[PDB]
């Protein structure tokens, strides 16, 4: 996308989202990042939405195929699960590459830095979901470290109802439960996050209240599933 204007890439990413063309969306936002300028709040959302949808479809397909593969235990099901898995890993590597070159190092504000570090944790978490061999532990620690640094910043710099802070804690909780084999840590994080946000709701406008309570409902839904 080197020959397209940054503003045109952003405009086309928004069109692709409206058309539910998420692979296109992601390629446009990848091109926008590679222009080298920092991203605005809205632009960070476009980047995240695009890749979340792309890898979300890959994860869903991988789970279908992995389930078929486990029921079977010719080479076809394993081969095709491997194909999808490699394609998923490539998308995760691409996002992690964008964060590392050079979104995170240039992100100084809490809202941008926490957002990118949450993504870094998320895409390592997706790598961990399919990891088996020599690096599954290292991948898990990479996810944990990114999430932890984002948590530390968000607790210092953001109110407990901040949607980015809440979504980070939600996803770190899922990491604890689903990846790190730490359901007690997952439950404790979700409960403390929910309770501290509840106590801060009185400070919010009607619209911010809606933003925060919507994410708190997701924390509550997980707690209901986990307890």
């Amino acid at each position: 996308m080197g020959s397209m204007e940054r503003a045109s890439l952003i405009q086309k990413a928004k069109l692709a989202e409206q058309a539910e063309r998420y692979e296109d969306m992601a390629a446009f936002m990848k091109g926008a990042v590679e222009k080298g300028e920092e991203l605005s709040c809205e632009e960070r959302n476009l980047l995240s939405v695009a890749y979340k949808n792309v890898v979300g479809g890959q994860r869903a397909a991988w789970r279908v195929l992995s389930s078929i593969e486990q029921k079977s235990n010719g080479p076809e099901v394993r081969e095709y699960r491997e194909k999808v898995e490699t394609e998923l890993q490539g998308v995760c590597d691409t996002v992690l590459g964008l964060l590392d070159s050079h979104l995170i190092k240039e992100a100084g504000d809490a809202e941008s830095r926490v957002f990118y570090l949450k993504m870094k944790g998320d895409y390592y978490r997706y790598l961990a979901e399919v990891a088996t061999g020599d690096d599954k532990k290292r991948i898990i620690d990479s996810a944990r470290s990114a999430y932890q640094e984002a948590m530390d910043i968000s607790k210092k710099e953001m109110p407990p109802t901040n949607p980015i802070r809440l979504g980070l804690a939600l996803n770190f909780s899922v990491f604890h439960y689903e990846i790190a084999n730490s359901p007690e840590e997952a439950i404790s994080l979700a409960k403390t996050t929910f309770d501290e946000a509840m106590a801060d709701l009185h400070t919010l406008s009607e619209d911010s209240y809606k933003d925060s309570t919507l994410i708190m409902q997701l924390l509550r839904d997980n707690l209901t599933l986990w307890t």
Partner: peptide, 8 residues
């Protein structure tokens, strides 16, 4: 267990 969605 649900993780965060991108859009409302």
């Amino acid at each position: 267990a649900g993780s965060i969605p991108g859009r409302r």
